[PDB]
Assembly symmetry: D2
Homo-oligomer: 518 residues x 4
Amino acid sequence: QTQQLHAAMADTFLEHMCRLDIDSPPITARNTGIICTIGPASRSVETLKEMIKSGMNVARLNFSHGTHEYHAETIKNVRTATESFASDPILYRPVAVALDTKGPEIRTGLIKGSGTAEVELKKGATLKITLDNAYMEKCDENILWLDYKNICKVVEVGSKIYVDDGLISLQVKQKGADFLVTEVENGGSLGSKKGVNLPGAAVDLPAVSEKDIQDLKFGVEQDVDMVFASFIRKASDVHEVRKVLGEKGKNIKIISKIENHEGVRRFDEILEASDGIMVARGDLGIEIPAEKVFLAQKMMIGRCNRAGKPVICATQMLESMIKKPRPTRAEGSDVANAVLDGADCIMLSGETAKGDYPLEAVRMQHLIAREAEAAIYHLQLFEELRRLAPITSDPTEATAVGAVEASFKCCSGAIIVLTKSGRSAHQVARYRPRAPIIAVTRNPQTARQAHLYRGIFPVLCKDPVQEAWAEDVDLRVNFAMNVGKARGFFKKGDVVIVLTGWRPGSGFTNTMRVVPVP
Amino acid sequence: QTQQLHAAMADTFLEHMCRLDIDSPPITARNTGIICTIGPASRSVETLKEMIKSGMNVARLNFSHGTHEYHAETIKNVRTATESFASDPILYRPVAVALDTKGPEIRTGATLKITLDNAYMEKCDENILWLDYKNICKVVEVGSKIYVDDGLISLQVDFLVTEVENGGSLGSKKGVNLPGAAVDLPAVSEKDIQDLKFGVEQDVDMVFASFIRKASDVHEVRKVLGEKGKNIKIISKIENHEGVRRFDEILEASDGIMVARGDLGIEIPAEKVFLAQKMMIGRCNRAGKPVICATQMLESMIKKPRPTRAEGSDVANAVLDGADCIMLSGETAKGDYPLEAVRMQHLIAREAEAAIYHLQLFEELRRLAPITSDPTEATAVGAVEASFKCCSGAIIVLTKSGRSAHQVARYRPRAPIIAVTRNPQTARQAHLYRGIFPVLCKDPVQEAWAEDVDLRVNFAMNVGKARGFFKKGDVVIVLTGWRPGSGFTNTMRVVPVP
Amino acid sequence: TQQLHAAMADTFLEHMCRLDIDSPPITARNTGIICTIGPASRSVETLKEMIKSGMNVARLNFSHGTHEYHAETIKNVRTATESFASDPILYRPVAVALDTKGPEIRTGLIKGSGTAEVELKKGATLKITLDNAYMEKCDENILWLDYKNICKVVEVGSKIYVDDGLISLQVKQKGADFLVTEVENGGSLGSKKGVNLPGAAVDLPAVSEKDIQDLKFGVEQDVDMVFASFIRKASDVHEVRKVLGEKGKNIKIISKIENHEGVRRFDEILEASDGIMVARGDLGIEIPAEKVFLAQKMMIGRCNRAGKPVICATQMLESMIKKPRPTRAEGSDVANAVLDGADCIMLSGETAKGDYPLEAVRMQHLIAREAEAAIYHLQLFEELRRLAPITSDPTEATAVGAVEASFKCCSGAIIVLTKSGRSAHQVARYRPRAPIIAVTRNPQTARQAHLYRGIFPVLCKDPVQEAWAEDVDLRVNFAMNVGKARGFFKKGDVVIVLTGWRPGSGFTNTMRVVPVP
Amino acid sequence: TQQLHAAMADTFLEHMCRLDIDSPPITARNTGIICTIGPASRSVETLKEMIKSGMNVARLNFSHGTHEYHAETIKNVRTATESFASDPILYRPVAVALDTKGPEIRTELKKGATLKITLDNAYMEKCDENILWLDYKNICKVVEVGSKIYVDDGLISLQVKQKDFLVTEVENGGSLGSKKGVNLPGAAVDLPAVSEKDIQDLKFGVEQDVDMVFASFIRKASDVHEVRKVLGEKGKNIKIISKIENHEGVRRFDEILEASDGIMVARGDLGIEIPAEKVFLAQKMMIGRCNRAGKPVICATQMLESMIKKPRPTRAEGSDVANAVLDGADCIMLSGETAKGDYPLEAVRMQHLIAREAEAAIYHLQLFEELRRLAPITSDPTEATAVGAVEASFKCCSGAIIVLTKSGRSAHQVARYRPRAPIIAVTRNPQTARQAHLYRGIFPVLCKDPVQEAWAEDVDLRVNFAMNVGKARGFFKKGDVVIVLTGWRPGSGFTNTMRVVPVP
């Protein structure tokens, strides 16, 4: 009658679908992490507190724009909002900070010297592209400067050039030395500093530009939790970011953004090298035909679920909400289906960065994800995850799968996991329990980074280390108990699964207990 | 390396997903019917010609607005466009006409009082709101919610006392929705009665009947359509809680279903619409009755030449869910890019159809398939099993009424179902079913029936060769019957293409 | 090894295709072997070899023998079993089972002799009498039997079967105190042979005066279980339960299903019983012989589904009464009982009176071990978990997690500390591949555990240590030492360990994955 | 009826749970019964009863008996069989199978004693406690120190300790005799594919027009190829069934199967060569691989052994028969039970009764799902038509699948998908009719009606003959739905048409 449990018990997926029930309400816990891009509509301490209350788990900073001073202040503000709740550790919600790199972008110049000016473009008309910096702030209906120095070499005649999220389409007629002449194949308003794509072209910008170097250094100085690396093409790109981050940034997670055809093709090597993946559908759906994006998304989510590495679904998930308080039916569907596909996290960009309804957008992602989570066909999912798993003598892995089996058997209210590094909780998440995973840690970075994983609710235990280690273990379990009760995941006398190890330190998780809530 | 054949052979759905390949191009055939709403953007004969070339299969006329004269001219223009291709039956594509009814409506005329007092009819303001639904008090209790102007405003409860739960600009003659209520307005309005007669007179192929709440609303629509309209398909629009809850009885009485998501997401929480969509698609798939996914599928294309990433995903996921048809409303009625919208649904649908996990899907449709002594059903399942076993280029079905080809479609073959018919209405109505590619044979009835049967099979061979579904020497499946007339399909053959 | 290539197959057909005669099984054998004890196997000396050969349960057939005789058999089984108690690592618990006579029909003596036989010829006449003057004067013309009411339950046309159904008779005339019959299947007729009336509704009591005395004797002798013969319905089981009473309340009642009504009323019988015997001997006389595999598979499935022990019995290695090795059908029967899901398999004449009792035990051991490895655990465990219920019981949740974990790491064993056996029973019901080493201090728990597939019971003799954590470890390390000594695993393998959070029954909640020291 | 409650279960466990002794099977029994003919069964009058009791194939064991003797058996088989010929509606074809002697090795022993094996022909007539002569000249090349040697159907076990001779130690002792059979477990025995006697016997089989050969001691594909060569052009249509009898045969099973027309699981000899506890693994592997390949497989040896002396079988025997069928065996077999026993007719009837019960208890839902999943997409029309027919047969629970066939092949292709419905294979070819018995579910009927002058009418006459057969034998009745398979032109290789038709 609740949590789509009648659908959960179907012997076929068709029957599962037939039993999906709009009158079967979900549980409290939402498992899929929500990443919100911060910008002018959401960077105030005031709004950020409401973002957090509304379900934001990760704050994304887009380094395609803005100065270090600006990003430093956003980061300061996220931390002020986040620590405003720290006085009761039981109700404190950790919040991660993500740096999203500019990476190898092509950008246009300023329309008539203004960052906000635009010119309407009639379809069929003519337009000159120039690399002459003379016109870098004098773009208009007739001449359009962009910043890719090498553009003329990697494009031939008849090549297609796309501007502003692929919405403006241009065809190369004649090649010059510092220029291109083009006809507006598809028209609309042209604005300032818009993204440009050359889908037919072997673009040769570096993996990690000088600007990216400076930004990644700022990321280390600012103690960011993860980097979302733009336009990753191959494993060596990932290795370059990892080496750039170097020793000071060794614990920073690298999520590779797959946004072009080469990244999809070389996906397996990229995943191996990365800490996680973002399906960056914006650019991806300009670089490859828009009608193939769902194939790429489902392939990458599947391969990440198979590897146990976090995957993020991104871009235009609730786009209409930039201007409207409720989303379109396609948007509702997109969010639900990302969760049903297996995505660990879902993302907001303009919806939270600049839109008129940032909070409504976060709340809608929260609502849809929780409904979709209840609609998952765990019976087949869990069977297939168990089947496809390399079978190993690893005792931590055996403990994790037993816990998840145990949690299904008793419909547990949670799987409580003590973890220093997060790994033990990550191992549970990989097997996709219905039960929320309460990951208890003293490590603040573990607690923030754990939001990358479906089902993990990180809680940051601030209690002092007790002299007797068994009493210290029991202290943290009890903390987890108090957190679940306060958030309404479970109540006195419900059963929960508890995972602990046999000695202190990382790598010893080997003990699964089935315990009633006190 | 074509048609996601690699992913097709996976032992698990997870491995199927992992094998999906953006570099594995689909075959030419696109199976999912595309329904386009016609309006100022798309109504001229020349544009309609291009709409058909772009992939429109069904022209939807929204009777919520427009005169009979207007709609009659729209239908005439659809038919001029469609018949401009009639000279070559091998390439001719039938186009269906669908009449989507206005249906029963509630219309208007902090703290706010709702009054039914018709002296307050033209005296609407911030203290007094008049409504035209006299039974509203029977249907709503204390605490019930009331939405105004397609959801824009929110309220809580021969008079009603209400606090305004979500404010806005309140206008004249606005739509009202009563979430969770058993609305007892008649199954059909006065206008609807007249529009349905017009539909019959104009020889429309199907009716999309609005705001269907129970089996008896369907029976009423059926009764209005009457004997002259007995062959017109009734597709029930499920738009509110009651229709979802009483889905099984509606489905049994209907020819098929529309998941009317626009109205559904005003009536039920927006975050639950996907549940209702997936339930209805699965139940229609289990019954073998056509289901249409509707509303905002490519909505940004009203203004823009490319869709959003969520819209791309929505179309694909509707197809993967099992929807027989996908629909366009404003995108084709009013938008700046109608042709591009139709083309994008075609491209996505075709990719999605190749990505289907047929191995589990057919296995489950088998398992849930009732054992009956019906010969046509046994022949259909055999033909679909045979088509997977030999990777046939098509399944060719001779059909008078469509039913034989519908029975094949419900088992969801990968191979296109070429439904050869001499009945023009059957050829139009067949677009409602996933996988059916209808062809209208215009050749005279040969004196020897055996030869007239072979003439039609050979017609289907010429269509597939011309359209690039298969070539000489490929194997196709062919369904025929033991005598003339409907109901006798019992013969499945594996035949080389000549 | 262990048919692990076959185990990994994604279909049953492919699993079959991968079964490999060159993939040796593990040392552990999970299916209990029940051996009927008689003159071939009763001496302490021979009982010691029975135990070493793999016997887990000694069955005593109360269809024959006096209480004085059966008390001596029990004493001998206990003396043989305790001869191994000096080394607790190699001690094997052995259960004692009492199989009731029940409502049997028996013929009299051929010409005053226990061994004499006469030949009955097809078509000849044979008169059945109830007159006790002929009780010891049966011959080819006159056959006495002890069912006084037989004339009221048969008609003309009725068939009457004698001697494991090998001799058959058709009633030509009903008299008042007799029946005139015609021989259909002839053969050698001996003394005191079992009789079946498949058509008839036999009205002998489910629990006779003699059965009552025998069940009271079972209680007094501390038997582990009772196999109740000819159970027809739930109330029959309740009559046995009533006789065992409060004092016999921990004795397991295994209902023997050996007639048509027992099969028909199976579900109510199982609900009332602690387990089932597929008593195939009488069963294949009471119903058509070609239907017995149907009843066997039905009963084994229903028992596996209910989580109740089920025993496959009768003629499994029959030829081995006379020969040192079995027929191919017999080889197949034993393997297929195990593949069906039988917790235990049984030997009757093979061990009671045959010439090769030790060989018959060894052979059941060898075949069962091979069959166990060949089980398709992938589908079995998936179905057991689906068909089980989602429940608020924390011990069930831990049991199913311990089994799942055992598959993931291909554990050497699941080690379970248990007082009453229930926690190890809960693991067994999920059919892990890993042997379940059940460590108990309770002697009866230890013996009765043999009724569950996969459980290797070990009886801990060490006194309770004051420090409970240390007492837990003591028993876990004892299990480790048994596993190494029996070759189940070696140092550095991984095993699953199940304990509770405190001492006493009913707290099993802790699963650990630990290396073998 | 027909365990149809059990047939609908969603799991195998629930399928087991619903098996019902009071759910009676249909009339049709699908599993062929192969009966060894000998003193007990060889008279024309007994052979008539054997046919009426369920015999489909008469096996002749050429390990003993003269060509004259066997010729007379064959003659009697055909006399009994043709006595039913007057009514083709009711006529049951009976096949004749020739089972070869095959290669052999021939020659009180105390446990722990030392015994020398000599190939020194000196001691041909002088074996004893200390020296034992063998006729296998290459024995030393195929055995190692530590190799086992079994003597006389496994009674005696020797182990090699030093390798023209071998010094062995007795491991399992017993009474040694003259001319006792020898087996070499795990060895690659290099004896010829066929003995000189086998070659003569195989040519006699061609003379006598036998339907199939059961070739003894098949170890490798080349063994099958040599049997095929001996049968030659005149014998090219005779089915070769390889008897798998030892470790090498089991290990080289894939190549043997590909080269053969089918397999016998030769459990008697296999349980001498390999540990008896492992024989069930060998059987289940070979039956599984035969099902996957669509080739007939026979289960043999001791299936109803106790019935040589008794009129009812043991419970283990009943179980073995039912389990061979549930394993997927196309045929089951009787040896001494029919050749020499006191109850030949009862043994045949009991295999009939068990088989039919077990066929109803099959879990077709999972079985059919897996066969399709493991069966390649190919462009072959007959295969596609065949799978379509079986699917259609399940969807309407048809009374039969009627298949016209010249060679048998179209019917064989249906049989591999394991329908519940009997497959009535209508042919004009008498050898095809007899050979069809090798395949689970095929009831071959031999049509003797004149060829009609319109080919489509001649097709229809054969379809209606099958209808009369099913009606006459109680498989179905007027108004039942049956599946019919035919082709688009005459001659083999063109079956492509599936129709669902009411029985007239």
